[PDB]
Amino acid sequence: WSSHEQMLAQPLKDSDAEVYDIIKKESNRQRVGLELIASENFASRAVLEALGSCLNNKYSQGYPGQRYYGGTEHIDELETLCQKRALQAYGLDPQCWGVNVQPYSGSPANFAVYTALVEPHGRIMGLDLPDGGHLTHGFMTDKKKISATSIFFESMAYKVNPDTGYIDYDRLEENARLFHPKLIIAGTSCYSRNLDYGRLRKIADENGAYLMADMAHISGLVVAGVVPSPFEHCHVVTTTTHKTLRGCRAGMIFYRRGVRSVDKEILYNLESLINSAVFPGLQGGPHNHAIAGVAVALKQAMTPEFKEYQRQVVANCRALSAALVELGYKIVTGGSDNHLILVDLRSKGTDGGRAEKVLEACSIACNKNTCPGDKSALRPSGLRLGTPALTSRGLLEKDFQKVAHFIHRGIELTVQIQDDTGPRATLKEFKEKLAGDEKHQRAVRALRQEVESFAALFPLPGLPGF
Amino acid sequence: WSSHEQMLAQPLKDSDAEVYDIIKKESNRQRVGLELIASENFASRAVLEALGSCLNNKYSQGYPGQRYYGGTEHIDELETLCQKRALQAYGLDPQCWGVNVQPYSGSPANFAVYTALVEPHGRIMGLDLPDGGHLTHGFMTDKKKISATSIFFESMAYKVNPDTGYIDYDRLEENARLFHPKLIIAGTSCYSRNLDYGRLRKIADENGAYLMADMAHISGLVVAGVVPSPFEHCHVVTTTTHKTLRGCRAGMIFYRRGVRSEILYNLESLINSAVFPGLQGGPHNHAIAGVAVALKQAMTPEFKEYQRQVVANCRALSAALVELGYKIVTGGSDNHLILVDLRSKGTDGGRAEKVLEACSIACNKNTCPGDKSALRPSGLRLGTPALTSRGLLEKDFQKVAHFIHRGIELTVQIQDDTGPRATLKEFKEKLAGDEKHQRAVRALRQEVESFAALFPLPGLPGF
Amino acid sequence: WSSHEQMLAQPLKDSDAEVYDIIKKESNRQRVGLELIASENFASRAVLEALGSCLNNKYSQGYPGQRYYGGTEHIDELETLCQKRALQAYGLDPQCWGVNVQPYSGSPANFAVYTALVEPHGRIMGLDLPDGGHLTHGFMTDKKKISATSIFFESMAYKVNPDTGYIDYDRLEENARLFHPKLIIAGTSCYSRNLDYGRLRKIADENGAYLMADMAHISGLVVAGVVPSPFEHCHVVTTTTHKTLRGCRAGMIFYRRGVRSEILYNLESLINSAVFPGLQGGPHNHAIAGVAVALKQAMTPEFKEYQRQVVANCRALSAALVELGYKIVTGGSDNHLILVDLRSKGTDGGRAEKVLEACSIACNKNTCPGDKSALRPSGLRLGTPALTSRGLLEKDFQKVAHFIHRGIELTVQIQDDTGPRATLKEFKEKLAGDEKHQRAVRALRQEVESFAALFPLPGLPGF
Amino acid sequence: WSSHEQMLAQPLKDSDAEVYDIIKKESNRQRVGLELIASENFASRAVLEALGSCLNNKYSQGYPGQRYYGGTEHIDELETLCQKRALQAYGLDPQCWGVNVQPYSGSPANFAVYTALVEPHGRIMGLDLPDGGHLTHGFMTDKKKISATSIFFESMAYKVNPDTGYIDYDRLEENARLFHPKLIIAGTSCYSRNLDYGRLRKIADENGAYLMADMAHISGLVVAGVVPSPFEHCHVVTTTTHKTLRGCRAGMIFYRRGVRSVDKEILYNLESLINSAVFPGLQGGPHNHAIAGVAVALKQAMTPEFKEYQRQVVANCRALSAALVELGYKIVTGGSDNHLILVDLRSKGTDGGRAEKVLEACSIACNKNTCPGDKSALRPSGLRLGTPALTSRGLLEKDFQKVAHFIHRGIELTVQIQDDTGPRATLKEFKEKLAGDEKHQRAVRALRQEVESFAALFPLPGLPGF
Ligand SMILES: *Cc1c(COP(=O)(O)O)cnc(C)c1O
Ligand SMILES: *Cc1c(COP(=O)(O)O)cnc(C)c1O
Ligand SMILES: *Cc1c(COP(=O)(O)O)cnc(C)c1O
Ligand SMILES: *Cc1c(COP(=O)(O)O)cnc(C)c1O
């Protein structure tokens, strides 16, 4: 009873040794590994410190103008500030753009938008998952609706041309006339090229639909001006605050304000619809500590250092890509305009399914992903590789060329093991063959060692070993 | 780059002076004010430290043993551990109960459950908002569906008896037969009494519906065994991890496993699939560690003692207000809060909350079962969790009751000066634009803040 | 071809002997039986002749002045005329009322209205089936939506007070506030009392809902002014054109025009668009002519007198049964039918309807407000429209009451012989497989049919 | 009060002179006009006599096995008989096919099927309206759902290739994979070619969807074996009972029974779902007089005379088509396989919108319809012409060649008037110019005379001038 007050003041290290130890091991794992998973990054110490603030305590349902409770003087300064920085970072005129900074994450932001502009059973069109689309843009089969987007709304995907790897805008244009979407989504999870927002706006307008961009993956590149901005043609732009923006996990919803079209002119009614959908529609108390973190990240994102960082991200990807091509690997669309590339491993006689597991055992992180061709999702041919994470650690072109070779050594190893299993062997048997065969296990150990020694050469953003 | 590395290692104080200053002022505001808003609390230093961990960086869609990406060895140890502590804290047998610890907050947890068990347009019944219910349990008018629960599903509320302030279980029993709910919700935002879970389970079973408890507000009291547990009769229990549980903001979904009545439970896979890949993306592992830390602290006898104190304080605050002539809805409370009917003093919570706020006494308005209009709620909701975390005891809450009373008297004054009939905007002007009054506020604020500064403020060292 | 032309000019008797024979036997069955099924009637020769017209051949999608195809000069004269007579028959000012005469039947008319005013998942409230409501007003269980109304829309029933047999308007008033209906239905399939349309309009307005009356059963009584008109308080009135109106099978949708409360009515275009191109295709013009013919006949004093006789007969039949010791739900009736609670004789409508059928006395079972099980309805619904069209008067219905009584006694007998507890299939065996009994049936059938043959059978000359 | 009994026995002629007169004028209109509207026909006297039977009186909700009331001995003989004849007429084995004969019309039958197999918001794919599809197969715009099919369900149309006029099965195959239909509809309102049911079954099976044929327009041709049967590949076949089947207005639902697929095999659950949807789902008391009419029509449809009639129907269409082609008219898909043709009037510098009204004034009935090309529905280029109606009146090839010339004289007249109005004149102005200009009005009168004199040469099926 007396120690209750001490309990509240006791550091994590002393209070919960078990959780503390987990964080420590995790921190060390991140340090000695090579992060190539495209959606991964490292938040700055500043951002992380914001999350532990007393901002966790205040309930502030509503918005700066109208909150359900009082005592929000400072919470209001914060959310207002965060909104100012968000618009600023993207060179947006507050008279043409507004922004909601309360979404809990990327998926919640998207859903708030659908709930506001689409409504139950409204039609939505998004990039097909196997072609690089995201779950939240629609995901269903001929017998079931899996994603909440597909469950509560009516979704239909649009594909990429498998012979070029590019989104087939022509086919989408024709299909939109028959499907009658209320909203079209411009955003991807695994696509290395810029999106033709202008074309998509024409198609959207033609069908009277809204054009929503989900820039989650390129949000950081956009700020630095390294890839064309989606704010030029879209009505709404959703995004995560982590990934390439490098903040804590959260989301934001940018929306247009003012005149939409002439004749006499009609206006944008996006603002109130979106805000009401976020609250009291879908969420409760906003997570202010996360809003401060996002704010901090937005300030850092406007610095020339961040600008230079993003140029480096894209340059590294180009270098990594060229080095892999020189090694004989096939890159979808032949290359990239951004931070990632999709490597078609068919060019090496294997698949991303087996490759990702072998590379993981070597402490090289990345993930499998189907290539536009692929006649089966149960054996994706590609590997998605992104440069954001390692670039935040200071890796430059030369470093990524060395990384390309580690990955290659990995693919060679994966091929070795596969040939040692059989043509009709299962992924489970493959994984087991890799775990219980000292022969391959020796190869793994040796490559892991080089991979981790090379990784330890670079700093690990965050708190002092936390 | 030279400076790029340092930008990422730089402290918040130096990196972003503006945000830092805001936190500082906020920290100070919390310190000198008296927090009586029932859903507020103070997270421990340990919990807050977890949020700043490198756990922020890892993407772990899926679940332990079912991850999309590799490299989740430690994230798995964490989520698994968090689940173990969640079941443990509530004395739940892992063969009868399972738990999802990925919800981003209270509302997201509820929605995941509806999406899993109810499905589009499925019927849901919950306590009517004006009678103390929560938005996420249903909120619509005769012309519009406001809450996402009411938009994507078909909701119908059940009311409390305005003459007793208690949920009218009889009427709910009759209406369930006509409405045919697929799910009934047992949980509140402003109700001072224990819920008759057993009765609700009978009604749910009768209609073949699921009984979901939303213990967000009493989750902490439940752990300490200070109020009956909803795990005894419900099929599912959702909850926030903050509020009375005192963790960081997040949510959890407890669900039954095993035999239901041979017929088994299919809750687990439905709920997990709804959370992901259904509604969410990457879980927030730093928040999961925070919840884990909070669950360990919640099993300590200190936490147990804390919760007893919370309820004792509420009883004391309640008695002191009754002695001062205030009317408490249902006459008293079984938990951490009370709904004070200000009609007994000739005013409303709408005007009272603003005057008390100006005096640095935080609380909020809320309609009382009677109330013939939501635009003039008669009550004030007051909770003891926050101040109890600061060490306040019965004697302290009696002093607090007096400050609140001085406040009510002041609100009434600004009311007599405005006339028996005046808008709320007129009242506020008289409050902020009257020598004697703005002066009255200043004087009470001073005493309120001096008394408040006598107690410690949980959290990180010095902001 | 030589014979092809004649095949199309050939009479039914020569063309299809098998179908012809069926009609003949059916015609004879109708002649020698006693029709007491409340929804049955006999269409006049004039009405039937219209159905065989060349009006069958013309496709006229759309409406007068709004046709898809040309060549509708006469179809337009017809539909326009039919609309004029419909409004006229009910004393409706064409500036306050409009009417759609294309519905294929009663159910299609109701559905068109829901589709127009309610829309997918919109809420609808109607009388509970077991309390005398109609399928199309809502029909679902706790596990399944059976009626298309319950499948495409969200329905919730309102009940009658089992102690009085009257619709409990108070409870409906309270439930409407919680359910938030978009449309409330005033109409029944088995209810002997007038509906409190005024009360229902107050409740509808309070919730901003539309009040739709489904007068299918009393449409004829309404025309003759024998029961209060639903056109006084409702916004929409749907109806079958057969039953008590005595036309061919079809339906109509009456809707208000002008000012509702400035706010006007938008019913017309919504309803018309829902019927077409919404739900139907080419209208059945031969049926529209039949309805027109029936509406002209319905405005004659002869029809007026007929309807008075219908209600008088019901009163007489009712009194004779009461004198015989039978219990009538709500004690009596205001219209053409009565619901007889057979519990007062130790049996149920389920067994009674089958025995009476075997005696050539037609009627059907129906649950009484009390009834603790639909698998053993206690009542028998009896209507006087059909026999009244055959000329039966009070004295005749008293004789009919006795035949029915002899029937009930017989059903009870087959019941005593089967034991206080026996399935329905056992009862039927004893009925058809017992010297004394099948013999009892034969004897009563004979008297029933001899008495029935004393009256004329409306329709075409000789089939 | 006394005459009440007389009132019930009074003939229509004496009872309601006004309605009687209308029928008479209508009967005469049908006699002197030339019916080319593809969905029109003339019911036989036998069929019409059935409609006036005492069958109008009996309420029989439910089905032969289970009715809500008793006294259905004969109604049961009737519905049972009608079902037997329906299956028989189409050479269907009652162990593989079942049939519901209670639908009130064509549209109600389709809706009962959607309600049974698709369910609320289920996806449905049908031929696009402007390409010859039917309303009940789906009809919506980018802002509104008009047809009840589009309101209660989620529909998406599939188009015909505008360069060939044929349904583009390839595109439909691709789109079905993205749309995930639960049911695909094979049926048309204005399409002159046979449907590739086999191809559609492959596509349906691929997506696990049901294949429903709506043979309303070719139902009669199918019975006579003049066009391939949809019962060979479809799971369900809906149809009107009038149109080419020549019965009274009603509808039927044919559905498969027995084994569906192997592996071990799964069965068809269509029967109970469809029956329950019709009742107590959507309808109330069946219209027995209409069921007898359908029965009578089904018996007549199995006669060699009917068989010969249908061959004549198709031969006439071929002749009408050739005569119009020789006159320089463009027929969509170049010709027809059935009872109708879609004439593209662009080949004559006018549209079906103006043409249908001029031809109507000349007592030549037909209707406008957009041609696959058409860049606007507000000016459809085609005229749909069917031969069923006139063929029932005995018209043969020579007769249809004369009809082709009357129609041509009509088109020439329509062109004359249009040129007399202006390039940007409205259809309303065109219609008014045709009604208030004695010059054109004289042309109309003269052609009408020839048209009606020639029409009076043939018999008019039905009752003696009724
Ligand atoms: C990652 C990603 C998301 C999901 O973000 P969460 O924060 O995990 O919920 C949504 N959309 C796109 C385009 C993404 O890349
Ligand atoms: C507070 C509360 C919630 C909402 O929690 P959030 O974390 O704000 O999103 C849900 N349900 C009940 C019963 C509550 O008290
Ligand atoms: C009979 C009846 C109906 C149904 O009419 P149908 O013509 O059978 O389709 C609808 N509503 C009420 C109130 C009825 O009595
Ligand atoms: C005509 C037609 C219909 C409509 O029939 P109705 O009886 O008018 O309701 C439905 N489907 C198709 C394919 C048609 O040709």
Coordinates of N, CA, C and O in Angstrom, one line a residue, chain B residues 48-122:
Chain B
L48 N 5.2 4.4 -19.3 CA 5.6 5.5 -20.2 C 7.0 5.1 -20.9 O 7.2 5.4 -22.0
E49 N 7.9 4.6 -20.1 CA 9.2 4.3 -20.6 C 9.2 3.3 -21.7 O 9.9 3.3 -22.7
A50 N 8.2 2.3 -21.6 CA 8.1 1.3 -22.6 C 7.7 1.8 -23.9 O 8.1 1.4 -25.0
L51 N 6.8 2.9 -23.9 CA 6.4 3.5 -25.2 C 7.5 4.1 -26.0 O 7.3 4.2 -27.2
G52 N 8.6 4.5 -25.4 CA 9.7 5.1 -26.2 C 10.7 4.1 -26.7 O 11.7 4.4 -27.3
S53 N 10.4 2.8 -26.4 CA 11.3 1.8 -26.8 C 11.5 1.6 -28.3 O 10.7 2.1 -29.1
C54 N 12.5 0.8 -28.7 CA 12.7 0.5 -30.1 C 11.6 -0.4 -30.7 O 11.6 -0.9 -31.8
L55 N 10.6 -0.8 -29.8 CA 9.5 -1.6 -30.2 C 8.7 -0.9 -31.2 O 7.8 -1.5 -31.9
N56 N 8.9 0.4 -31.3 CA 8.1 1.2 -32.3 C 8.5 0.8 -33.8 O 7.6 0.9 -34.6
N57 N 9.7 0.4 -34.0 CA 10.2 0.1 -35.3 C 9.8 -1.2 -36.0 O 9.8 -1.3 -37.2
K58 N 9.4 -2.2 -35.2 CA 9.1 -3.5 -35.8 C 7.7 -3.7 -36.3 O 6.7 -3.4 -35.6
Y59 N 7.5 -4.1 -37.6 CA 6.2 -4.4 -38.2 C 6.0 -5.9 -37.9 O 6.8 -6.7 -38.3
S60 N 4.9 -6.2 -37.3 CA 4.5 -7.6 -37.0 C 3.1 -8.0 -37.3 O 2.5 -8.7 -36.5
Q61 N 2.6 -7.7 -38.5 CA 1.2 -8.1 -38.9 C 1.1 -9.5 -38.6 O 2.0 -10.3 -38.8
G62 N -0.1 -9.9 -38.1 CA -0.4 -11.3 -37.8 C -0.3 -11.6 -36.3 O -0.6 -10.7 -35.5
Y63 N 0.1 -12.8 -36.0 CA 0.2 -13.1 -34.6 C 1.4 -14.1 -34.3 O 2.0 -14.5 -35.3
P64 N 1.7 -14.3 -33.0 CA 2.8 -15.2 -32.8 C 2.5 -16.5 -33.5 O 1.4 -17.0 -33.5
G65 N 3.6 -17.0 -34.2 CA 3.4 -18.3 -34.9 C 2.6 -18.0 -36.2 O 2.6 -19.0 -37.1
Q66 N 2.1 -16.8 -36.4 CA 1.4 -16.5 -37.7 C 1.7 -15.1 -38.2 O 0.9 -14.3 -38.5
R67 N 3.0 -14.8 -38.3 CA 3.5 -13.5 -38.7 C 3.7 -13.5 -40.3 O 4.0 -14.5 -40.9
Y68 N 3.4 -12.3 -40.8 CA 3.6 -12.1 -42.3 C 5.1 -12.0 -42.5 O 5.6 -12.7 -43.5
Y69 N 5.9 -11.3 -41.7 CA 7.3 -11.1 -41.9 C 8.1 -11.8 -40.8 O 7.5 -12.2 -39.7
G70 N 9.3 -12.1 -41.0 CA 10.2 -12.8 -40.0 C 10.9 -11.8 -39.1 O 10.6 -10.6 -39.2
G71 N 11.7 -12.3 -38.3 CA 12.4 -11.4 -37.4 C 11.6 -11.0 -36.2 O 11.9 -9.9 -35.5
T72 N 10.5 -11.7 -35.9 CA 9.7 -11.4 -34.7 C 9.9 -12.2 -33.5 O 9.0 -12.3 -32.6
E73 N 11.1 -12.8 -33.3 CA 11.4 -13.6 -32.1 C 11.0 -12.8 -30.8 O 10.3 -13.4 -30.0
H74 N 11.5 -11.6 -30.7 CA 11.2 -10.9 -29.5 C 9.8 -10.2 -29.4 O 9.2 -10.1 -28.4
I75 N 9.3 -9.8 -30.6 CA 8.0 -9.3 -30.6 C 7.1 -10.4 -30.2 O 6.1 -10.2 -29.4
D76 N 7.4 -11.6 -30.6 CA 6.6 -12.8 -30.2 C 6.6 -13.0 -28.7 O 5.6 -13.3 -28.0
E77 N 7.8 -12.9 -28.1 CA 7.9 -13.1 -26.7 C 7.1 -12.0 -26.0 O 6.4 -12.3 -25.0
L78 N 7.1 -10.8 -26.5 CA 6.3 -9.7 -25.9 C 4.8 -9.9 -26.0 O 4.1 -9.8 -25.0
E79 N 4.2 -10.1 -27.2 CA 2.8 -10.3 -27.3 C 2.3 -11.5 -26.6 O 1.3 -11.5 -25.9
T80 N 3.1 -12.6 -26.6 CA 2.7 -13.8 -25.9 C 2.7 -13.5 -24.4 O 1.8 -13.8 -23.7
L81 N 3.8 -12.8 -23.9 CA 3.8 -12.5 -22.5 C 2.6 -11.6 -22.1 O 2.0 -11.9 -21.1
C82 N 2.4 -10.6 -22.9 CA 1.2 -9.7 -22.7 C -0.1 -10.5 -22.6 O -0.9 -10.2 -21.7
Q83 N -0.3 -11.4 -23.4 CA -1.5 -12.2 -23.4 C -1.5 -13.0 -22.1 O -2.6 -13.2 -21.4
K84 N -0.4 -13.6 -21.7 CA -0.3 -14.4 -20.5 C -0.7 -13.6 -19.3 O -1.5 -14.0 -18.4
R85 N -0.1 -12.3 -19.2 CA -0.4 -11.5 -18.1 C -1.9 -11.0 -18.1 O -2.5 -10.8 -17.0
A86 N -2.5 -10.8 -19.2 CA -3.8 -10.3 -19.3 C -4.8 -11.4 -18.7 O -5.6 -11.1 -17.9
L87 N -4.6 -12.6 -19.1 CA -5.5 -13.7 -18.6 C -5.2 -13.9 -17.1 O -6.1 -14.1 -16.3
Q88 N -4.0 -13.8 -16.7 CA -3.6 -14.0 -15.3 C -4.2 -12.9 -14.4 O -4.8 -13.3 -13.4
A89 N -4.0 -11.7 -14.8 CA -4.6 -10.6 -14.0 C -6.0 -10.8 -13.7 O -6.5 -10.3 -12.6
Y90 N -6.8 -11.4 -14.6 CA -8.2 -11.6 -14.3 C -8.6 -13.0 -13.9 O -9.8 -13.3 -13.8
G91 N -7.6 -13.7 -13.4 CA -7.8 -15.1 -12.9 C -8.5 -16.0 -14.0 O -9.4 -16.7 -13.6
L92 N -8.1 -15.9 -15.2 CA -8.7 -16.6 -16.3 C -7.9 -17.8 -16.7 O -6.7 -17.8 -16.9
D93 N -8.6 -19.0 -16.8 CA -7.9 -20.2 -17.2 C -7.7 -20.1 -18.8 O -8.7 -20.0 -19.5
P94 N -6.5 -20.2 -19.2 CA -6.2 -20.1 -20.7 C -6.9 -21.2 -21.5 O -6.9 -21.2 -22.8
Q95 N -7.6 -22.1 -20.9 CA -8.3 -23.1 -21.6 C -9.8 -22.7 -21.8 O -10.5 -23.3 -22.6
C96 N -10.2 -21.7 -21.1 CA -11.5 -21.2 -21.2 C -11.5 -19.7 -21.7 O -12.6 -19.3 -22.2
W97 N -10.4 -19.1 -21.7 CA -10.3 -17.7 -22.2 C -9.0 -17.5 -23.0 O -8.0 -18.0 -22.7
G98 N -9.2 -16.6 -24.0 CA -8.1 -16.2 -24.9 C -8.2 -14.7 -24.9 O -9.2 -14.1 -24.5
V99 N -7.2 -14.0 -25.4 CA -7.2 -12.6 -25.4 C -6.4 -12.0 -26.6 O -5.2 -12.4 -26.8
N100 N -6.9 -11.0 -27.2 CA -6.3 -10.3 -28.3 C -5.8 -9.0 -27.7 O -6.6 -8.2 -27.2
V101 N -4.5 -8.7 -27.8 CA -3.9 -7.5 -27.3 C -3.4 -6.5 -28.3 O -2.5 -5.7 -28.1
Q102 N -4.0 -6.5 -29.5 CA -3.6 -5.6 -30.6 C -4.5 -4.4 -30.8 O -4.1 -3.5 -31.5
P103 N -5.7 -4.4 -30.3 CA -6.5 -3.2 -30.5 C -5.8 -1.9 -30.2 O -5.1 -1.8 -29.2
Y104 N -5.9 -0.9 -31.1 CA -5.3 0.4 -30.9 C -5.9 1.2 -29.7 O -5.2 2.1 -29.2
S105 N -7.1 0.9 -29.4 CA -7.8 1.7 -28.3 C -9.1 1.0 -28.0 O -9.4 -0.1 -28.5
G106 N -9.9 1.6 -27.1 CA -11.2 1.0 -26.7 C -12.2 0.9 -27.8 O -12.7 -0.2 -28.0
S107 N -12.4 2.0 -28.6 CA -13.3 1.9 -29.7 C -12.9 0.9 -30.7 O -13.7 0.2 -31.3
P108 N -11.6 0.9 -31.1 CA -11.2 -0.1 -32.1 C -11.5 -1.6 -31.7 O -11.9 -2.4 -32.5
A109 N -11.3 -1.8 -30.4 CA -11.6 -3.2 -29.9 C -13.1 -3.6 -30.0 O -13.4 -4.6 -30.5
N110 N -14.0 -2.6 -29.7 CA -15.4 -2.9 -29.8 C -15.7 -3.2 -31.2 O -16.4 -4.1 -31.6
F111 N -15.2 -2.3 -32.1 CA -15.6 -2.5 -33.5 C -15.1 -3.8 -34.1 O -15.7 -4.4 -34.9
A112 N -13.9 -4.2 -33.7 CA -13.4 -5.5 -34.1 C -14.4 -6.6 -33.8 O -14.6 -7.5 -34.6
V113 N -14.9 -6.6 -32.5 CA -15.8 -7.6 -32.1 C -17.1 -7.6 -32.9 O -17.6 -8.6 -33.3
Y114 N -17.7 -6.4 -33.1 CA -18.9 -6.3 -33.9 C -18.7 -6.9 -35.3 O -19.5 -7.7 -35.8
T115 N -17.5 -6.5 -35.9 CA -17.2 -7.0 -37.3 C -17.0 -8.5 -37.3 O -17.3 -9.1 -38.3
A116 N -16.6 -9.1 -36.2 CA -16.4 -10.5 -36.1 C -17.7 -11.3 -35.8 O -17.9 -12.4 -36.4
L117 N -18.4 -10.9 -34.8 CA -19.6 -11.6 -34.4 C -21.0 -11.2 -34.9 O -21.9 -12.0 -35.1
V118 N -21.1 -9.9 -35.2 CA -22.3 -9.3 -35.7 C -22.4 -9.3 -37.2 O -23.4 -9.7 -37.8
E119 N -21.4 -8.7 -37.9 CA -21.4 -8.6 -39.3 C -22.3 -7.5 -39.8 O -23.2 -7.1 -39.1
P120 N -22.1 -7.0 -41.0 CA -22.9 -5.9 -41.6 C -24.4 -6.0 -41.3 O -25.0 -7.0 -41.6
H121 N -25.0 -4.9 -40.8 CA -26.4 -4.8 -40.5 C -26.9 -5.7 -39.4 O -28.1 -5.7 -39.2
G122 N -26.0 -6.4 -38.7 CA -26.5 -7.3 -37.6 C -27.0 -6.4 -36.5 O -26.5 -5.3 -36.3

